[PDB]
């Protein structure tokens, strides 16, 4: 079962945007399939979602703008390694 991760420093957290990371041993087309599946399942429950980006070559997964209420649902999706809530980065 997949894990949920977020920034330990609370003011830097960006709830509402998640990086859904999939297991490395998957097909290239599996990232898009799971994104589409998450969208369908969320819509059935009356939740709107936006897929901002589909990851290829670096790590397999996608970037989704959705409500945090859907994380329980999203963690049950097959091929999901973990889900990370977006956070801030700063010029040093």
């Amino acid at each position: 079962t997949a894990t949920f991760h977020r920034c330990a420093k609370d003011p830097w957290r960006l709830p509402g945007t998640y990086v859904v990371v999939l297991k490395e041993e998957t097909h290239l087309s599996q990232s898009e399939r799971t994104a589409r599946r998450l969208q369908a399942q969320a819509a059935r429950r009356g939740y709107l979602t936006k897929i901002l980006h589909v990851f290829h070559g670096l790590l397999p997964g996608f970037l989704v703008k959705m409500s945090g209420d859907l994380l329980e649902l999203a963690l049950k999706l097959p091929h999901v390694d973990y889900i990370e809530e977006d956070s801030s980065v700063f010029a040093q």
Binding site: A8, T17, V19, H53, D86, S87, S88, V89, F90, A91
Partner: protein, 281 residues
């Protein structure tokens, strides 16, 4: 007379340096003709924000660092050619997601470009990120040299990303007196996640005020930019160097036991490397 930081790193071929950062002034005399502004942009702000900020063009941080790496008169590798990606906004802020998409863009560009040496400078930090550390690891595995700022938190670099990624060269900051840098009530990060230190206080470099201006800036961003410059010089001479081979050479040629470990917390002194970066002789 040379600037102190360029004296410090001085002992007694087609390398591309990718910078992820703010917008840059690509027509500054220091980097003109050797910096290309790519189409990549992923920032937490509206597109027109940087056109209606009467104050500035939001390019001061990026321009200085491009100058520290490759500046004709004040840079480490006067050679280098550089490629700019905009990931930090008008407030100096970015996202972990935007940095990921940028690293993904670099991977795609590496696959298109002919086999050659690639340096990636990440002069930014946030909290420890599992995904950002994973993306950095994968890029390193692909033979890319990644250089990041240790962070300006006067804390353990283990709590920060990309700082905490073992496959990334994590750089702390030291000054002209070989002391760790004080920034406000904070300063350079320390600990086992720091690979080495480099000049990061009173660093003269390109000012985006005008095409011939210079300004002094301090931070671990400047420290990391020195090491990206040193790595670019090293790869210009030996293009087939592994990341393990380059890291080995950085540690090897660095100045040793020169930092006053009294500025660090007692329990961190043994864990922090007492190395200041230098070029091979």
């Amino acid at each position: 007379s040379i600037p102190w930081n360029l004296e410090r790193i001085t002992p007694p071929s087609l390398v591309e340096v990718y910078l992820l950062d703010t917008s840059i002034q690509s027509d500054h005399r220091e980097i003109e003709g050797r910096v290309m502004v790519t189409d990549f942009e992923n920032v937490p702000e509206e597109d027109g924000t940087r056109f209606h900020r009467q104050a500035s063009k939001c390019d001061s941080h990026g321009t200085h660092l491009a100058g520290v790496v490759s500046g004709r008169d004040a840079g480490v590798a006067k050679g280098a050619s550089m490629r700019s990606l905009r990931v930090l906004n008008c407030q100096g802020k970015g996202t972990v997601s935007g940095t990921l998409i940028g690293l993904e863009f670099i991977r795609k560009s590496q696959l298109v470009q002919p086999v050659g040496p690639l340096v990636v400078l990440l002069p930014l930090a946030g909290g420890y990120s599992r995904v950002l550390n994973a993306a950095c690891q994968r890029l390193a595995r692909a033979g890319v040299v990644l250089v990041t700022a240790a962070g300006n938190f006067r804390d353990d670099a283990c709590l920060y990303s990309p700082a905490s990624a073992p496959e990334v060269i994590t750089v702390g900051a030291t000054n002209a007196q070989d002391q760790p840098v004080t920034l406000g009530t904070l300063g350079t990060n320390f600990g086992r996640c720091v690979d080495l230190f480099a000049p990061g206080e009173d660093i003269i470099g390109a000012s985006s005020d005008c095409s011939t201006c210079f300004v002094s800036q301090s931070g671990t961003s400047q420290a990391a930019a020195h090491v990206a410059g040193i790595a670019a010089m090293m790869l210009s001479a030996e293009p087939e160097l592994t990341l393990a081979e380059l890291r080995q050479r950085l540690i090897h040629f660095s100045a040793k036991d020169v930092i006053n470990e009294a500025w660090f917390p007692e329990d961190q002194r043994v864990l922090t490397p007492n190395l200041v970066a230098a070029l091979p002789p």
